[PDB]
Ligand binder design. Structure first.
Ligand SMILES: CCCCCCCCCCCCCCCCCC(=O)OC[C@H](COP(=O)([O-])OCC(O)COP(=O)([O-])OC[C@@H](COC(=O)CCCCCCCCCCCCCCCCC)OC(=O)CCCCCCCCCCCCCCCCC)OC(=O)CCCCCCCCCCCCCCCCC
Ligand SMILES: CCCCCCCCCCCCCCCCCC(=O)OC[C@H](COP(=O)([O-])OCC(O)COP(=O)([O-])OC[C@@H](COC(=O)CCCCCCCCCCCCCCCCC)OC(=O)CCCCCCCCCCCCCCCCC)OC(=O)CCCCCCCCCCCCCCCCC
Ligand SMILES: CCCCCCCCCCCCCCCCCC(=O)OC[C@H](COP(=O)([O-])OCC(O)COP(=O)([O-])OC[C@@H](COC(=O)CCCCCCCCCCCCCCCCC)OC(=O)CCCCCCCCCCCCCCCCC)OC(=O)CCCCCCCCCCCCCCCCC
Ligand SMILES: CCCCCCCCCCCCCCCCCC(=O)OC[C@H](COP(=O)([O-])OCC(O)COP(=O)([O-])OC[C@@H](COC(=O)CCCCCCCCCCCCCCCCC)OC(=O)CCCCCCCCCCCCCCCCC)OC(=O)CCCCCCCCCCCCCCCCC
Ligand SMILES: CCCCCCCCCCCCCCCCCC(=O)OC[C@H](COP(=O)([O-])OCC(O)COP(=O)([O-])OC[C@@H](COC(=O)CCCCCCCCCCCCCCCCC)OC(=O)CCCCCCCCCCCCCCCCC)OC(=O)CCCCCCCCCCCCCCCCC
Ligand SMILES: CCCCCCCCCCCCCCCCCC(=O)OC[C@H](COP(=O)([O-])OCC[N+](C)(C)C)OC(=O)CCCCCCCCCCCCCCCCC
Ligand SMILES: CCCCCCCCCCCCCCCCCC(=O)OC[C@H](COP(=O)([O-])OCC[N+](C)(C)C)OC(=O)CCCCCCCCCCCCCCCCC
Lengths: 64, 154, 51, 72, 139, 383, 193
């Protein structure tokens, strides 16, 4: 079994180390952070609409 | 000895580039618990408890691109080696453990001494502490062993 | 507004990611790489013939 | 001073290879940017036709490689 | 109406999601798939339920164009890159990456020979590197 | 700011005059610091002088306590003037950056020269003494302001997001204060409205519990070098020293009303050192006085009465809110008349898309009625 | 009273013309509703602007009761005062009205931008990049939150604080104005003895 072997373990592990050190940043910037920003957008939009309505309501409430 | 080889993800890398040049929402995550650690409100942690989210997401993507697609005949799991998985788990587990140890807070380890003051310290509590310190490393080993054995047997 | 992931180029973001986000993990990985190439980078002729 | 650390320092014009790039993006977006194409951790899409197309293709090229390079 | 995509949903049903309040609800009682107001949003039931919005031709009373003074903010900075520009940059980069990966895939799976063949007709058997040169005292 | 060849020429030309000026400023600042340090050791409280230890309740890590490890010398005007304190603060910033550069030089020997070329090509990390004319000083200040703009929003977002995600205000007044604290600089925040946020956050995170990442963001926003960051109690010490000096000068100015007699340029510098007045805003004396008075009001009566300032985290967020510009929006509204997915028009609609359009289009009600009637008929037939 | 210097120069006629122009473009969008129902942004802006304008006019001397009874009456005490009825302060009020108009204009601009964005969304011709460019605040907040390790997309506590926010009804406005008038009167009483 090669899965139990060690005669070329370093070169074999270079695949994981390249994935970790060089490909993970690309996936981070190109795929993951974009998806999570996209997920964030709706709630932030809703909260900021509510904040603007709150400002308008306070503006109206101070009139007499 | 220097062996030059390539992973079996090149077509999947091509598909990722083609299908993720534009943004898309993600709403289904294999391990969602990394995002919600605190369940009672008004509780907060001064430690960087959300540092694992990025590594978790990348690890899930990588292991899924390998393991799930390996069901297709002649698809190769390029990393399927016991000691390589040991290296991966060593990196993650020991890195987090050293993050907690570099904090230089020894009281953090008070809970390792299992039991209460009623129990004899040398013959019960100290032996339990020895076993628990052993169990941390055994948890690392068992994690990587379980991942390797399941794939191999299946 | 400024964000590392959106404004910095890829090499710069890589350095920032592994120096101010995951420095301990990078250190442990480099340690393991050195160990592997120090103790797991040799193969005898008989080992090559067998496997 | 030699190289910029900011992605905003452009090396080409905005219209460089606009047409081919738009065709490539059209190919990417037509089936993937859909409500029912909800992925599981970016690896398993929701669109059925992606499976229907990609499973045979992956098997075909892997089998060709195995038959002509490995089992040979 | 066109065939273009809309605001991404991730395959989620907004009537039961954890952020459902952020999605407006229409007269029919179906929460929108986007922050916008949608009149014809629907829900489809596969193994899992998912919300879908079908674009359609609808006329909306268009408030007249405001002056540039009241919506333009000239706070741009040298590091700033807009989402449109980022999309352009990433599109070009991914186009070139896709071409390169395609060439790599073709070579790897159809042209590259495997090393150390039994017959010796294909692939290299390996060789030594970093051998000394011009160092007689070494031996 | 990005590096440029003109700035490189400027800093190379003024390198040695700048070093000589820095040395002279070092002598003067050492004298000023010696006076202040002697006064602190002699007249300071026992906790402040003995450096009492304040540990966090979770991991028992020591950090500076605002109440115990910071002390406002109310009678410092007798020994040290306001201008001397300002000089010491400016020199502390310049000395920190120079010290980091000297450490790099000593560490790497002669291999730091190309990095020195990168260093002199930008005004971000060069001392103020390298500018020998007004225009050069203006460009240097512009670089400092640019770095502040780059760094402040991350600090503000970190604070706001962590609190909002893990806690909520107790009462309506705290809610209003918290919401108005993080408004953009295009609107004027009322310090009386925003002050309760200080106590609300004192309940959450005091300065003694500030996290290392938040500290890094804050030091970036304050033009304090962050590499090597090291333990959080080093840059934390720098922050504490800078704001302790600032509070001493603030007490002097408030008590003696020096700002009213302060000239325009000196007033602008005073506001700038408090991170209240960017130079690119081209503020006049009215605006500067308004911002300074708001800062004094935010400090509150208790500052003069007892020398106790509000929570330092909230204070830093408040002052750095002046560098939180509105999000940029460029382009005429007519650009919204275009289309984004014309490149897909050639593809048309497939069978599934046509089905979705048919079922969810204007005829959706008719299709739904027909489908439900057909299903009901089939169910009845089945039974 | 002490003299007050105006921050900006503008005539009352110019201000009224500007208000009419601002409210005239939104007539099609403006929709009437029951007095007890919640009000819209256009209704709130119109009420505030007209209230300030007619308060200034009544202080000046242009006693046009027909409009004053509509744009200024919100309390039974106010109605009684109107029935009985039937310099520095003025300058400050005019400046405040001008500032209020300049404050409302950006809100209408954002509303128009959102209308156009919605129009393009319903057509299927709106990319997320365009939406983020034309809604910069949302874009910046999301990007910053993710960049500082705020991955989560749900904010239950802030929503709990802001979820029940909505524009008030006319009757609620009347009650709040009555409360404020009572508070001001009580304040002047304390001022007196
Ligand atoms: C002596 C014989 C030769 C060999 C000499 C070797 C010397 C060795 C020295 C000693 C080293 C000891 C240690 C070795 C440890 C090895 C461990 C290991 O392999 O681990 C597995 C592990 C497997 O990783 P993986 O998961 O497969 O991912 C890595 C992949 O590269 C894919 O990962 P990725 O996709 O994430 O990578 C990013 C990728 C992102 O994606 C892309 O950019 C897409 C493209 C991908 C390219 C890379 C994939 C390669 C695919 C196979 C080859 C393709 C075809 C080649 C054709 C050859 C024909 C003969 O971008 C790039 O790759 C950037 C480069 C792009 C180049 C584009 C060039 C365009 C030229 C255009 C010219 C036009 C001219 C016009 C003129 C017109 C005139 C009129 O390997 C690594 O991690 C990398 C190991 C490298 C170690 C360093 C070796 C030293 C450097 C050698 C360079 C030799 C150059 C000279 C060759 C000349 C021809 C003979
Ligand atoms: C030749 C061998 C070299 C060895 C290798 C070195 C490798 C490089 C490592 C860095 C070395 C230092 C570089 C120069 C720094 C400049 C001097 C200095 O301390 O500036 C003050 C300044 C103090 O900072 P702070 O945060 O305000 O301090 C808080 C205290 O509470 C402040 O106290 P305070 O609040 O009460 O205020 C007092 C203040 C009041 O004073 C003033 O206000 C007046 C101004 C005084 C300071 C002026 C500094 C000017 C800096 C620029 C110099 C010009 C550069 C010109 C460049 C161009 C040249 C052409 O005066 C001070 O700043 C005094 C600070 C304490 C003295 C520190 C010096 C101790 C070492 C020297 C003695 C060694 C004796 C060896 C005996 C051997 C026996 C066997 O220092 C810094 O900015 C810190 C350095 C920043 C870089 C850190 C890099 C990592 C360091 C790791 C070291 C680990 C151990 C070593 C092994 C490393 C192996 C990996
Ligand atoms: C005469 C002068 C006066 C006397 C001297 C005075 C003293 C001077 C020294 C002190 C100066 C301090 C201030 C310096 C400020 C400038 C720093 C800087 O670099 O700024 C970025 C600077 C531009 O700055 P900027 O435009 O002003 O923007 C500044 C902004 O504020 C943007 O700011 P930012 O904050 O965004 O940027 C920060 C960024 C800074 O970083 C960067 O920006 C990256 C720069 C490199 C980018 C390279 C991109 C290009 C790559 C090309 C690759 C090759 C292409 C092909 C070439 C083919 C050639 C044939 O990120 C970082 O700070 C990351 C720090 C990472 C630290 C790493 C620590 C590792 C520790 C290891 C672990 C240890 C653990 C403990 C273990 C203990 C065990 C016991 O970047 C450049 O200019 C890039 C230069 C690229 C050069 C060409 C490519 C490399 C050439 C290598 C040649 C090798 C030859 C030999 C080969 C031999 C082979 C055998
Ligand atoms: C897509 C592919 C592209 C290519 C990818 C390339 C491949 C990358 C693969 C792996 C990448 C990740 C590796 C991570 C490793 C682990 C890192 C880690 O554990 O970090 C812990 C930790 C994290 O860093 P941090 O301080 O918390 O903050 C990092 C942030 O990035 C700070 O950010 P910040 O925002 O807070 O501050 C911003 C700003 C703030 O500005 C300032 O603070 C003012 C300016 C400060 C100037 C520097 C002051 C230094 C003071 C003394 C430092 C201690 C010296 C110790 C003794 C010397 C030891 C050699 O700071 C800067 O701009 C820093 C400028 C530094 C420029 C240099 C960056 C590296 C470029 C490459 C140059 C070297 C090439 C050598 C190899 C080739 C040879 C032919 O690091 C430290 O504690 C720092 C200790 C520094 C010790 C000195 C360096 C030791 C390493 C050996 C140096 C060898 C020199 C060779 C000379 C030439 C010989 C021929
Ligand atoms: C190329 C150069 C290579 C260099 C290599 C050397 C390593 C790197 C050098 C330095 C690099 C720069 C950065 C270093 C870290 C900076 C940390 C920091 O920011 O501290 C700020 C901090 C300033 O903040 P602060 O508010 O003033 O005070 C801290 C607060 O108290 C804080 O309050 P707190 O509430 O946090 O209080 C807690 C605090 C309390 O502690 C302190 O803060 C006090 C200072 C430290 C005291 C440490 C000594 C404790 C007593 C030792 C007793 C040993 C007895 C043994 C007897 C044997 C008899 C046979 O921390 C602790 O409790 C930690 C105690 C240490 C525990 C050590 C456990 C080790 C376990 C070993 C495992 C097995 C190892 C392998 C097997 C070995 C045997 C076979 O700095 C310090 O306090 C001192 C910093 C000293 C820096 C290191 C200087 C390096 C000198 C190098 C000389 C040798 C060079 C060799 C070169 C070789 C050729 C190249
Ligand atoms: C067919 C047989 C199969 C056998 C299978 C056996 C299992 C193999 C498993 C392999 C995969 C998993 C590997 C996990 C990682 C293991 C790590 C490990 O044990 O490595 C230890 C090894 C020990 O190194 P070493 O073996 O060179 O030790 C030297 C000791 N002498 C000189 C006495 C021989 O670490 C390394 O290889 C890395 C060393 C370099 C990096 C560290 C340098 C700093 C050291 C600090 C202390 C000393 C200096 C003073 C302080 C600093 C001053 C600047
Ligand atoms: C989220 C859950 C996903 C579940 C997906 C379920 C898919 C159901 C597939 C049904 C059968 C498909 C048959 C395909 C036949 C192809 C031609 C052929 O000869 O193949 C025979 C091959 C092998 O059949 P064989 O073993 O009989 O071959 C005989 C050949 N000799 C005799 C020479 C040995 O069939 C397969 O291997 C098909 C197994 C499919 C298992 C499911 C894989 C799912 C994971 C991959 C998903 C990929 C999605 C990518 C999308 C894009 C991502 C960005």
């Amino acid at each position: 079994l090669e899965p139990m072997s060690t005669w070329y373990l370093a070169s074999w592990a270079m695949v994981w180390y390249y994935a970790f050190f060089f490909w993970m940043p690309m996936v981070w910037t190109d795929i993951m952070v974009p998806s999570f920003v996209y997920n964030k957008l709706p709630v932030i939009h809703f909260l900021q609409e509510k904040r603007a309505e709150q400002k308008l309501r306070r503006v109206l409430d101070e009139t007499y | 000895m220097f062996l030059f080889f390539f992973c079996d993800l090149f077509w999947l890398r091509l598909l990722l580039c083609m299908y993720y040049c534009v943004w898309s929402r993600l709403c289904f995550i294999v391990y969602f618990n990394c995002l919600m650690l605190i369940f009672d409100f008004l509780l907060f942690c001064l430690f960087d408890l959300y540092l694992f989210v990025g590594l978790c997401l990348f690890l899930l993507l990588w292991f899924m691109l390998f393991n799930l697609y390996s069901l297709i005949l002649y698809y190769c799991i390029t990393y399927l080696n016991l000691y390589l998985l040991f290296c991966i788990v060593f990196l993650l587990y020991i890195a987090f453990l050293f993050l907690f140890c570099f904090l230089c807070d020894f009281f953090l380890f008070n809970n390792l001494l299992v039991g209460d003051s009623f129990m004899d310290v040398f013959f019960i509590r100290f032996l339990l502490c020895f076993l628990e310190c052993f169990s941390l490393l055994c948890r690392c080993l068992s994690t990587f062993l379980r991942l390797f054995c399941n794939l191999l047997s299946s | 507004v400024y964000t590392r992931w959106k404004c910095d180029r890829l090499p710069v973001f890589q350095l920032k990611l592994f120096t101010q986000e995951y420095p301990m993990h990078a250190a442990v990985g480099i340690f393991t790489i050195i160990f592997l190439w120090k103790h797991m980078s040799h193969c005898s002729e008989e080992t090559e013939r067998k496997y | 001073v030699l190289f910029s650390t900011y992605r905003s320092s452009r090396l080409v014009s905005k219209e460089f290879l606009h047409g081919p790039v738009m065709r490539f993006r059209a190919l990417g977006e037509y089936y993937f940017q859909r409500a029912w194409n909800g992925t599981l951790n970016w690896a398993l899409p929701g669109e059925y036709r992606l499976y229907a197309v990609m499973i045979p293709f992956i098997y075909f090229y892997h089998r060709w490689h195995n038959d002509h390079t490995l089992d040979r | 109406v066109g065939n273009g995509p809309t605001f991404s949903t991730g395959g989620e049903c907004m009537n039961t999601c954890d952020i459902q309040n952020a999605f407006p609800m229409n007269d029919r009682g179906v929460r929108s798939s986007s922050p916008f107001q949608e009149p014809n949003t629907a829900i489809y039931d596969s193994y899992l339920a998912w919300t879908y919005f079908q674009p359609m031709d609808v006329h909306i009373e268009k408030l007249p164009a405001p002056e540039a003074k009241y919506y333009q903010r000239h706070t741009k900075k040298p590091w700033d890159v807009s989402s449109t520009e980022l999309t352009e940059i990433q599109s070009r980069k991914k186009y070139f990456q896709t071409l390169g990966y395609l060439v790599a895939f073709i070579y790897l799976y159809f042209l590259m020979p495997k090393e150390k063949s039994f017959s010796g007709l294909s692939g290299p058997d390996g060789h030594w590197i970093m051998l000394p040169k011009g160092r007689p005292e070494l031996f | 700011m990005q590096g440029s060849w003109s700035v490189l020429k400027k800093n190379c030309s003024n390198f040695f005059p700048g070093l000589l000026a820095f040395a002279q400023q070092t002598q003067e600042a050492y004298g000023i610091w010696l006076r202040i340090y002697n006064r602190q050791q002699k007249y300071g409280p026992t906790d402040f002088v003995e450096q009492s230890e304040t540990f966090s309740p979770d991991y028992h890590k020591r950090f500076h306590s605002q109440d115990k490890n910071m002390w406002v010398d109310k009678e410092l005007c007798t020994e040290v003037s306001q201008k001397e304190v300002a000089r010491l603060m400016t020199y502390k910033l310049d000395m920190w950056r120079m010290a980091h550069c000297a450490g790099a030089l000593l560490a790497t020997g002669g291999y730091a020269i190309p990095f020195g070329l990168f260093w002199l090509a930008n005004d971000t990390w060069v001392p103020s003494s390298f500018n020998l004319t007004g225009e050069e000083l203006r460009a240097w200040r512009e670089a400092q302001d640019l770095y502040r703009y780059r760094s402040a929003p991350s600090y503000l977002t970190d604070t706001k997001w962590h609190f909002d995600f893990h806690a909520y205000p107790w009462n309506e007044t705290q809610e209003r204060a918290w919401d108005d604290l993080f408004e953009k600089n295009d609107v004027r925040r009322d310090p009386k409205v925003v002050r309760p946020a200080a106590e609300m956050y004192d309940g959450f995170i005091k300065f003694e519990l500030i996290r290392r990442k938040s500290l890094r963001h804050l030091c970036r926003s304050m033009n304090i070098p962050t590499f090597p960051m090291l333990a959080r109690l080093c840059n934390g010490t720098r922050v504490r020293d800078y704001w302790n000096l600032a509070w001493c000068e603030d007490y002097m100015v408030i008590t003696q009303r020096l700002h009213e007699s302060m000239t325009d340029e000196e007033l602008y510098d005073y506001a700038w050192r408090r991170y209240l007045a960017p130079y690119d805003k081209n503020l006049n004396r009215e605006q500067l006085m308004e911002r300074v008075e708001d800062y004094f009001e935010f400090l509150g009566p208790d500052f003069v009465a007892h020398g106790k300032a509000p929570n330092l985290v909230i204070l830093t967020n408040y002052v750095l809110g002046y560098y939180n510009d509105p999000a940029y929006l460029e382009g005429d509204i007519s650009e919204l008349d275009k289309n984004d997915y014309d490149h897909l028009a050639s593809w048309g609609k497939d069978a599934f898309l046509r089905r979705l359009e048919f079922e969810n289009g204007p005829l959706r009600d008719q299709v739904e009625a027909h489908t439900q009637r057909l299903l009901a008929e089939r169910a009845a037939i089945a039974k | 009273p002490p003299h007050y210097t105006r921050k900006s120069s503008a005539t009352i006629e110019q201000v009224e013309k500007e208000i009419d122009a601002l409210l005239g473009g939104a007539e099609k969008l403006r929709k009437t509703s029951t007095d007890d129902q919640p009000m819209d942004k256009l209704t709130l802006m119109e009420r505030c602007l007209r209230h300030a304008l007619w308060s200034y006019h009544k202080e000046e001397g242009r006693y046009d009761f027909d409009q004053i009874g509509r744009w200024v009456v919100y309390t039974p005490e106010d109605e009684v005062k109107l029935a009985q009825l039937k310099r520095a302060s003025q300058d400050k009020r005019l400046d405040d009205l001008v500032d209020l108009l300049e404050r409302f204009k950006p809100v209408l601009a954002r509303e128009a931008i959102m209308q156009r964005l919605t129009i393009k969304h319903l057509e299927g011709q709106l990319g997320v990049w365009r939406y983020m460019d034309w809604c910069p605040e949302v874009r910046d907040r999301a990007e910053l939150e993710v960049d500082i390790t705020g991955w989560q997309w749900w904010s239950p506590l802030e929503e709990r604080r802001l979820l029940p926010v909505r524009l008030r009804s006319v009757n609620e406005v009347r009650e709040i104005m009555s409360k404020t008038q009572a508070k001001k009167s009580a304040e002047a009483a304390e001022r007196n003895p």
